[PDB]
Amino acid sequence: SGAIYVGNYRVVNRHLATHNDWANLVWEDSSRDLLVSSTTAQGCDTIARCDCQTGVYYCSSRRKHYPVSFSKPSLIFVEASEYYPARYQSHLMLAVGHSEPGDCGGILRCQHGVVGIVSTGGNGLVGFADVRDLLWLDEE
Ligand SMILES: O=S(=O)(NC1CCCC1)C1CCOCC1
Ligand SMILES: [Zn+2]
DSSP states (O other), X not given: OOOEEETTEEEEEGGGOOHHHHHTEEEEEGGGTEEXXXXXXXXXXXXXXXXXXXXXXXXXXXXXXXXXXXOOSEEEEEOOOSSSOSXXXXXXXXXXXXXXXXXXXXXXXXXXXXXXXXXXXXXXXXXXXXXXTOGGGGXX
């Protein structure tokens, strides 16, 4: 589990969105595994605006933050999972590292702020859903 809280937005994995998220929907994209809902309180997070390929992510199934190198956001044919079938997922970044389903929502951060959240795992890789292209999160 986990979310990003930027302004009056809450960014979560689409597959973990709650009824309250869907009842307060701003934007959602199944291909990216992302959903954004509206919040009453302002959040603590800054979104990275950059093309970094190094950062640190939180792995709940290790209670640890790991430094990683990761690929630029791409279309990755992802095998079906505990929460999704085998399919292509867009705006996905991969690193070598540990990821189980409940690790979804862990933040990946670089020197500029939050890059994305854990979205996929398996075969010794972790995938992160990028948010750095969602420029509208920074306003309104
Ligand atoms: O091993 S995967 O399932 N698929 C391969 C990844 C690159 C090309 C296909 C990978 C999907 C993202 O999360 C980590 C697992
Ligand atoms: Zn950066």
